Amino acid sequence: LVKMSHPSGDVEACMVQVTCGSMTLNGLWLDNTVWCPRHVMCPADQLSDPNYDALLISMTNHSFSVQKHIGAPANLRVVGHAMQGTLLKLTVDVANPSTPAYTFTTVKPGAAFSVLACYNGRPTGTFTVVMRPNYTIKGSFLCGSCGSVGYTKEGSVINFCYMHQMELANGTHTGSAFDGTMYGAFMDKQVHQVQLTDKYCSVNVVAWLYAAILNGCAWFVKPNRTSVVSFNEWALANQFTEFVGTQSVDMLAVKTGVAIEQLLYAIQQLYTGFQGKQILGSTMLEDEFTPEDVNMQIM
Amino acid sequence: SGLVKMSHPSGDVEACMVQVTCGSMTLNGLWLDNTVWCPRHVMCPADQLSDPNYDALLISMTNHSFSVQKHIGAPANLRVVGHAMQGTLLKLTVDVANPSTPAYTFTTVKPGAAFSVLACYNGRPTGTFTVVMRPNYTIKGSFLCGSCGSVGYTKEGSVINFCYMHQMELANGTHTGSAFDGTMYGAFMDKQVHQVQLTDKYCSVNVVAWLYAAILNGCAWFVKPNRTSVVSFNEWALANQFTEFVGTQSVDMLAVKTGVAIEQLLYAIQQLYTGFQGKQILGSTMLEDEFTPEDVNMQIM
Ligand SMILES: COc1cccc2[nH]c(C(=O)N[C@@H](CC(C)C)C(=O)N[C@@H](C[C@@H]3CCNC3=O)C(=O)c3nc4ccccc4s3)cc12
Ligand SMILES: COc1cccc2[nH]c(C(=O)N[C@@H](CC(C)C)C(=O)N[C@@H](C[C@@H]3CCNC3=O)C(=O)c3nc4ccccc4s3)cc12
Numbered sequence: 001l002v003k004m005s006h007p008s009g010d011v012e013a014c015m016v017q018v019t020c021g022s023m024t025l026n027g028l029w030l031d032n033t034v035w036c037p038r039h040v041m042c043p044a045d046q047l048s049d050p051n052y053d054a055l056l057i058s059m060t061n062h063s064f065s066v067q068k069h070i071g072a073p074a075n076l077r078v079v080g081h082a083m084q085g086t087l088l089k090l091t092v093d094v095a096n097p098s099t100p101a102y103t104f105t106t107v108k109p110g111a112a113f114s115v116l117a118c119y120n121g122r123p124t125g126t127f128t129v130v131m132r133p134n135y136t137i138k139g140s141f142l143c144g145s146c147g148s149v150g151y152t153k154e155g156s157v158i159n160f161c162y163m164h165q166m167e168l169a170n171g172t173h174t175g176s177a178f179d180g181t182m183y184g185a186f187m188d189k190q191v192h193q194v195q196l197t198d199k200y201c202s203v204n205v206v207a208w209l210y211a212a213i214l215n216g217c218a219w220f221v222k223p224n225r226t227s228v229v230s231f232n233e234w235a236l237a238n239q240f241t242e243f244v245g246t247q248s249v250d251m252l253a254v255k256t257g258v259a260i261e262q263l264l265y266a267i268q269q270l271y272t273g274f275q276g277k278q279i280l281g282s283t284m285l286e287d288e289f290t291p292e293d294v295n296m297q298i299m
Numbered sequence: 300s301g302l303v304k305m306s307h308p309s310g311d312v313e314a315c316m317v318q319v320t321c322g323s324m325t326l327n328g329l330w331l332d333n334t335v336w337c338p339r340h341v342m343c344p345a346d347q348l349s350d351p352n353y354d355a356l357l358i359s360m361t362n363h364s365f366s367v368q369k370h371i372g373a374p375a376n377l378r379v380v381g382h383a384m385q386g387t388l389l390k391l392t393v394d395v396a397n398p399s400t401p402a403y404t405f406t407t408v409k410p411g412a413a414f415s416v417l418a419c420y421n422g423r424p425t426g427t428f429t430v431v432m433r434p435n436y437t438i439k440g441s442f443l444c445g446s447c448g449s450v451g452y453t454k455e456g457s458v459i460n461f462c463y464m465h466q467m468e469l470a471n472g473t474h475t476g477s478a479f480d481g482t483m484y485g486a487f488m489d490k491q492v493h494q495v496q497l498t499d500k501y502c503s504v505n506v507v508a509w510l511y512a513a514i515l516n517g518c519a520w521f522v523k524p525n526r527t528s529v530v531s532f533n534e535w536a537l538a539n540q541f542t543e544f545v546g547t548q549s550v551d552m553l554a555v556k557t558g559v560a561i562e563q564l565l566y567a568i569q570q571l572y573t574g575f576q577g578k579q580i581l582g583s584t585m586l587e588d589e590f591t592p593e594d595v596n597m598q599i600m
Contacts, residue, residue, distance in 0.1 A: 002441040003303070007417065007424040009310030116308060123310075126427060127303040140303040140598045171301050171516065215472075283584050297441045 001211060001280075001289055001297055005114035005128040006153050012070055013098035017121025018090070018147065019065040026118045026147030027066065027090070028163070030099050034066050034076070034090040035178065036147045037165050038083055039188050047190035056083050064090055069121045071098070085180020086188045087163065104178035105152070105159040109133040109241060110201035112290050113152050113161050119144045130288055133199035133241050135184025136172035139164075150175070168195055202235060202243040202267065204287040209263045210252035211294045212280050218258075220279065225261035226268060234268060248291035300581040302512055302590055302598055306415040306429045307454045314399035317369045317377070318422025319391070319448065321360075327419045327448030328367065328391070329464070331400045335367050335377075335391040336479060337448045338466050339384055340489050348491035357384050365391055370422050372399070386481020387489045388464060401459045405479035408462040410434040411502040411542065413591050414453045416463070420445045431589050434500040434542050436485025437473040438463075451476070469496055501588045503536055503544040503568070508592040510564045511553035513580050515599050519559070520578060526562035527569060535569060549592035 018027040020040040027036035039047070041055045041063075064078040080091030107113050109131050117125045117140065129137040129150075141148065141164055150162025164175040165188050172195065176182045186193055213221065226234070232242045245260060253260055267285065274283055319328035319337040322344070328337035340348065342356045342364075362379045369375030381392030408414055410432045418426040418441065430438040430451070442449065442465060451463025466476040466489050473496060477483045487494055513519065527535070533543050546561060554561055568586065575584050 002428040002430070002439070004418070004426040004428050004441060005306065007310075007313050007427055008308040009313040009424075012308050012310040117305075123308040125305040126308050127305050129303070138300075138303070140301055140305060142598075142600065281585075299443055 001293070003128050003288075004293070004297065005126050006151070008114070008116050008123065008126045010098075010100045010158060011116050011149060011151060012123045014096060014100070015070060015116065015118050015121055015123055015149070016076070017067045017069060018088075019067070020059070020063050024120065025144065026121055026149075028147070028149050028160070029066075029068070029076075029092070029096045030102060032092055032095050034078075034092055035163065036088050036090070037163065037176075037188065038086055038088045039146070039165070040064075040088065050189055052083065056081070064088075066090065066092060067121060070123065083180075086165065086176045086182050087178070087180040101157045103157060103159050105161050106177045106179070106181075107131045107150075107152070107161040109135065110204050110287070110290070111152075112293065113150045115139065115150045115162065115164070116148060117141060117145055118148045130201065130204065130290065131183070132172070133201060134196040135186075136168060136174050136195050136198075137162075138171070139173040141167055141173050168193055170195065197239065199239045199241050200285055201287040202231070202240045202264075203246070203249065204290055205240075205267055205285045206243070206249060206260060206263050207252065207291040207294045208280070208286040208289055209266060210249075210256055210258070210291075211289065211298060213256045213258055214252075214294070214298050215280065217279055219277065220266045220270060221258055221262055222265065223262070224265045225259065226265040227261055228264065231264040231268070238271065240267070240271075246291060248295050251295055252291060300512060300516055302581070302594070304429045304589075305594070305598060306427045307452070309415070309417045309424065309427045311401040311454070311459055312417045312450060312452060313424045314372055315397060315401070316371065316417070316419050316422055316424055316450070317367050317375065320366045320368075321364055325421065326445065327422055327450075329448070329450055329461070330367070330369065330377075330393070330397045331403060332396045333392055333394070335379075335393055336464065337389050337391070338464060338477075338489060339387055339389045340447070340466070341389070351490055353384065357382075367391065367393060368422060371424065387466065387477045387483050388479065388481045402457050403459040403461055406460045406462055407478040407480070407482075408432050408451070408453070410436065411505055411588075411591065412453075413589075413594065414451045414462050416440060416451045416465075417449060418442060418446055419449045431502065431505065431591070432484070433473075434502065435497040436487075437469060437475050437496050437499070439472065440465075440474040442468055442474050469494060471496070498540065501541045501586060503532070503542045503588075504547070504550065505588040505591055506568055506586050507544070507550060507561060507564050508553065508595045509587045509590050510567060510580070511550075511557060511559070511592075512590065512595045512599055514557045514559055515553075515595070516581065518580055521567045521571060521580060522559055522563055523566065524563070525566045526560065527566040528562060529565065532562075532565040532569070539572065541568075547592060549596050552596055553592060
């Protein structure tokens with residue numbers, strides 16, 4: 001089991017640098033559109049309390065500059081601007097000839113996606129995270145990473161789901177979907193913001209227990225069962241997300257012969273502590289791997 | 300913690316992966332300029348995998364024995380016009396130079412150092428991850444049948460350093476391969492026989508970096524005034540499944556920034572190994588050695 005992200009090449013060919021005044025960050029160029037965080041527009045004196053409508057009104061196409069540094073580098077001309085939630089939709093005069101097939105999806109808590117971290121329009125690293133139940137991610141981002149992009153891929157279509165915007169007071173990160181809505185209803189302004197209390201992603205804990213059984217670690221499997229409905233009611237009071245079955249979990253159920261309901265019962269017992277024992281070398285429940293991960297990695 | 304498993308963006312290496320077939324055997328290869336590198340056991344008949352005679356096998360080959368195809372991006376009219384064997388790898392010469400060859404070197408990676416892996420099947424990139432070379436010359440990767448010829452690399456400036464070509468999964472979950480000079484890591488053999496790795500060890504210098512990352516995040520309950528010298532720690536390490544600590548400039552920057560000395564963390568390690576005393580560090584109840592000093596310097600700064 002490793003943290004496995006998609007190959008980033010197709011997304012690399014879409015990264016650009018966006019400049020507005022003396023401010024810069026990353027943007028994503030698809031077709032004739034460049035997407036980027038709207039706080040490019042924001043003077044340093046207005047970061048803590050910005051008026052984005054007033055700021056956008058004071059912009060012309062000419063306020064915005066877009067540079068591509070990767071591939072055959074190019075200057076693009078901004079021929080239109082618009083604001084969509086927390087994102088800027090610039091229109092440019094050239095279409096990206098390396099535009100992949102893509103959609104815009106919103107990731108759900110517990111689901112994994114790949115992030116391409118960039119600075120000044122240059123990809124520097126790639127990693128994968130799961131969206132946390134409190135709609136933050138446990139990333140690795142520094143000043144200037146804003147506009148870095150998160151995505152999944154089904155076959156050859158890339159599903160863009162995340163554009164990075166902020167690091168909260170705790171170690172964690174958040175950003176917006178490409179409809180422009182910030183995950184977790186956080187605000188793109190320079191203010192201290194307190195996230196909700198996080199939860200265990202139940203379906204990923206289940207996936208992880210199936211991975212243990214697949215590896216010969218099954219000491220926690222008992223005949224006792226907890227129904228999904230019973231589990232989900234118990235989950236409300238215990239900081240666990242609602243469990244929603246999928247095809248991937250069922251395949252692990254069929255492969256191991258252990259029913260989902262036996263592991264939901266197991267989670268309720270192990271949540272109190274492992275009483276001296278370990279599971280896959282761990283003393284705590286692991287929710288950072290998905291059923292798809294376990295399926296694919298241990299095919 | 301602000302620490303993730305950070306790989307280099309794979310686009311450079313994706314544009315170099317190809318599929319190499321010899322008879323009815325297939326795996327991945329690496330296309331750079333007029334050369335395609337792939338594991339030599341693509342030459343071996345399944346009946347003979349357990350005991351190959353790669354010298355005899357190579358004599359038996361002609362240029363026409365090998366077929367190379369690039370499926371991704373712009374595809375492949377690739378004709379093999381030369382072949383050769385270098386250690387456990389084949390070096391094939393092809394008549395088209397890869398137009399997307401990155402600046403590259405071949406360097407052997409050392410235990411404790413991290414590198415990016417591009418996992419591929421039948422010439423198609425499917426995933427990327429990063430690993431640290433274990434002190435017993437294995438990596439804890441995620442590889443299935445057909446991943447052979449997948450590549451591990453690091454990147455310095457514009458220069459890709461290719462350090463690993465995938466070859467085997469040992470009887471534990473664990474993986475090994477060769478450097479591009481042709482030598483298998485750990486002197487394993489590329490043949491279909493059971494092989495036992497040497498015992499693995501904690502990478503002391505990476506554990507030190509991780510504790511520094513803890514201090515940088517305000518997690519410093521484990522820091523005491525007590526110290527253990529490098530010499531005394533390294534003598535302790537031979538007795539306790541830890542690698543020799545070798546300090547570097549990257550570790551020094553961490554020590555200066557935090558104001559906690561390496562030797563304080565060497566003492567902390569000796570205590571934390573015996574037990575975390577019901578506490579955790581960066582969300583872990585056990586020492587973590589899969590993050591390098593360079594990792595912490597880059598990701599936390
Ligand atoms: C009292 O203030 C705080 C209290 C407690 C926690 C806090 N967090 C933040 C906060 O996150 N600010 C956002 C900015 C806001 C406006 C979205 C921000 O700095 N994003 C970074 C990535 C950040 C930085 C650290 N690593 C993270 O990934 C980024 O790349 C860029 N920002 C700008 C801004 C202007 C121009 C170019 C760029 S580029 C402020 C804050
Ligand atoms: C009784 O012998 C054993 C006892 C105990 C543990 C063992 N492990 C291995 C062993 O690993 N063999 C090598 C192959 C050898 C010869 C280096 C191998 O299967 N490589 C795989 C990747 C492996 C497979 C599972 N996931 C891993 O990454 C691969 O991709 C390909 N192999 C071939 C082989 C021939 C033609 C095309 C391809 S393509 C043998 C063995």
